[PDB]
Design a protein around this ligand. Structure first.
Ligand SMILES: CC(=O)N[C@@H]1[C@@H](O)[C@H](O[C@@H]2O[C@H](CO)[C@@H](O[C@@H]3O[C@H](CO[C@H]4O[C@H](CO[C@H]5O[C@H](CO)[C@@H](O)[C@H](O)[C@@H]5O)[C@@H](O)[C@H](O[C@H]5O[C@H](CO)[C@@H](O)[C@H](O)[C@@H]5O)[C@@H]4O)[C@@H](O)[C@H](O[C@H]4O[C@H](CO)[C@@H](O)[C@H](O)[C@@H]4O[C@H]4O[C@H](CO)[C@@H](O)[C@H](O)[C@@H]4O)[C@@H]3O)[C@H](O)[C@H]2NC(C)=O)[C@@H](CO)O[C@H]1O
Ligand code: NI
Ligand code: NI
Lengths: 158, 158
C-alpha cells in the first residue's frame, strides 16, 4: 500500500510523510467557505489487491497557523461530515486496486466572526492530516502524514 | 509467503485453511505401513526473499476418522520422526526463494492389531495439520491449516 501526490511526491510502503501545497481563495468573507479538496492531490493504492484488502482512515487532522486562529471548519470523509480539528478517528475506506485512486477528503474552513485582515500567510503550515492504513491479513498499522501548506495568502475583508 | 497444492487449491498470504484430498493405498495389511506424503502435494514460496527469510514449522497435528480409530503412527518432518497426533511444535524449515518448494511432511501409519475391513472410509476427514509461518522482518505469525481427506476407501484384510 502506498500513496503519491499530484506533483509526484510519494510515501512508500510502511508509511512516512510528505508536503502538499494547496491553492486557496485569495479573498473569503466571514460566513463563506474555503475548500481544500485533497481528492485531487493525494492518491493511494493496494500493492497486492487480489487476496488483500487495504483499510484507510483519517486518524487525526489538526489545524496550524492561521487556520487554527481565525477559522472554524469541518472535514468531509467519504460522504460524511466530521469536525476539524478532529475529535475522533473516522470510518474506513477500502483500497482494492493497484491503480492510484483518490483519498476522498475535503476541508471546509470558514473565517470566524472576529476574523479580519490576512488570515493565512503564504507558505505556512495550515493543517496536518494523518492517514492510517491497516489491512485484513496482518497487524500493520502505518501512518502516512500529509503536511498541508498554503500556496498563497488569504485575506478576510472586514 | 503462500502455499499451493498440486490440484490447484491454495492458501494465500496471511494464512487460512484448505481441504486436501489425497489418494491412499487401497489395501494395507497389519504390520505394513500406509504413507501419506504431503511433501508431493503442498508447496510454499517466499514472495520477497531479497530482504526477508520465512520460517515454517509443523505446529500441531491431529488424527480423525479411520486414522484415529484404526491406525497408530508418527509424522516425519524434514527428515525427523515426531509423535502423531503431534502436541508440540517442530524445528523450523527455511524458505528464501520464489520457487515453489515442498512442505516436508509425511505421515507413516500402521494398522492396529484389531483392524479389519474398511478402516478408512472414502471422503472422510482423516487429519488436520497446522503449518505456522513466521519471518525475520515483521511480527507476522500465520497459520495455514490443512484438512486432510481420504480420496478412497482403505481396507485392512484379516
Ligand atoms: C521505494 C522503496 O524502495 N520503498 C521500500 C520498499 O521497496 C520496501 O519493500 C517492498 O517493496 C516492494 C515493491 O514492489 C514489494 O514487492 C512486491 O511484493 C508483493 C507482495 O506484497 C505483499 O507481500 C509483501 C511481503 O509480505 C508477505 O510476504 C512475505 C514473503 O514471504 C512474508 O514474510 C509475509 O509474512 C507476507 O506473507 C507485503 O509486505 C505486502 O504488504 C504491503 O502491501 C500490502 C498490499 O497493499 C499491504 O496490505 C501491506 O500493509 C503492505 O503495505 C503485501 O502483503 C508481490 O506480489 C510483488 O510481486 C511482483 O513483483 C516481483 C518483483 O520481481 C515479481 O517477481 C513478482 O512475480 C510480481 O510480479 C507480478 O506482479 C507485478 C505487480 O503485482 C507485475 O508488475 C509483474 O509484471 C508481475 O505480473 C512484489 O514482489 C515488497 O513486497 C515490499 N516488501 C515489504 C516487506 O513491504 C519497504 C520495506 O522496508 O521499504 C520501502 O521503503
Ligand atoms: Ni505500488
Ligand atoms: Ni507468491
Amino acid at each position: 500500500f502506498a500513496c503519491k501526490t499530484a506533483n509526484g511526491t510519494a510515501i512508500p510502503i510502511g508509511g512516512g510523510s510528505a508536503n502538499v501545497y494547496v491553492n486557496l481563495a485569495p479573498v473569503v468573507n466571514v460566513g463563506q467557505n474555503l475548500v481544500v479538496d485533497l481528492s485531487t492531490q493525494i492518491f493511494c493504492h493496494n500493492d497486492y489487491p487480489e487476496t488483500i484488502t487495504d483499510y484507510v482512515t483519517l486518524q487525526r487532522g489538526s489545524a496550524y497557523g492561521g487556520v487554527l486562529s481565525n477559522f472554524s471548519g469541518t472535514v468531509k470523509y467519504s460522504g460524511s461530515s466530521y469536525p476539524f480539528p478532529t475529535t475522533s478517528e473516522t470510518p474506513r475506506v477500502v483500497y482494492n486496486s493497484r491503480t492510484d485512486k483518490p483519498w476522498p477528503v475535503a476541508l471546509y474552513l470558514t473565517p470566524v466572526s472576529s476574523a479580519g485582515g490576512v488570515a493565512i500567510k503564504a507558505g505556512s503550515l495550515i493543517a496536518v492530516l494523518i492517514l492510517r492504513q491497516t489491512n485484513n491479513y496482518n497487524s500493520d498499522d502505518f501512518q502516512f502524514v500529509w503536511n498541508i501548506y498554503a500556496n498563497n495568502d488569504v485575506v478576510v475583508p472586514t
